[PDB]
A paper describes a structure:
The structural and zinc-binding properties of [name], one of the periplasmic proteins expressed by [name] under zinc-deficient conditions, are presented. [name] has a noncanonical ferredoxin-like fold. Two zinc-binding sites with micromolar affinity are exposed and are located on the same face of the structure. These findings strongly suggest a role for [name] in zinc trafficking, possibly acting as a metal chaperone or as a regulator of a transport system.
[name] crystallized in two different forms corresponding to space groups P41212 and P65. The asymmetric unit of the hexagonal crystal comprises three protein molecules, but the interactions are so limited that they can be considered as simple packing contacts between monomers as in the case of the tetragonal crystal form. This observation is in line with size-exclusion chromatography, which shows that the protein is monomeric in solution regardless of the presence of zinc. Despite the differences in crystal packing with regard to both lattice and asymmetric unit composition, the conformation of the protein in the two crystal forms is almost identical (Cα r.m.s.d. in the range 0.49–0.74 Å).
Numbering used by the authors: 19 to 96, 121 to 179
Write the structure that this text describes.
């Protein structure tokens, strides 16, 4: 139950890249057949489309979404989910702490998240888990 997250904080710009097996987010590795499959896909799509909620960005930072991409056949019009987010924060000084607590609540099949961070300070790695879901930005 292992996802990657790449974070990049340069000034106003916050970039988030999630790479996860479909299993963690949707509950299965096939394309969507049954009603129960189509409803799990739609629940995951709706959640991944609200990144300020899923990554619990603090409202005080003034974060807004400039772009977001879901790359998977599950989310196209016709075995890995990629989710790319470009955010812009009016007060990025207030981004002190990234919490994946909400990601773990909304996708409880995710047991561990490997985070890479890149910032004016350099590169930083951490393994996050429901137990310790926080990372100093």
């Amino acid at each position: 139950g292992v996802a990657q997250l790449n974070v990049a904080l340069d000034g106003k710009t916050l970039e988030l890249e999630l790479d996860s097996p479909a299993m963690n987010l949707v509950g299965f590795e096939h394309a969507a057949s049954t009603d129960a499959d189509k409803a799990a896909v739609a629940k995951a799509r709706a959640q991944l489309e609200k990144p300020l909620e899923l990554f619990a960005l603090p409202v005080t930072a003034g974060c807004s979404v400039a772009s977001q991409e879901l790359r998977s056949p599950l989310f196209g019009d016709k075995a890995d989910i990629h989710a790319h987010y470009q955010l812009s924060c009016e007060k990025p000084e207030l981004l002190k702490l990234l919490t994946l607590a909400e990601f773990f609540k909304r996708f409880p099949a995710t047991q561990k998240i490997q985070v890479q961070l890149i910032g004016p300070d350099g590169q930083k790695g951490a393994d996050l888990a429901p137990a310790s879901a926080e990372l100093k930005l």
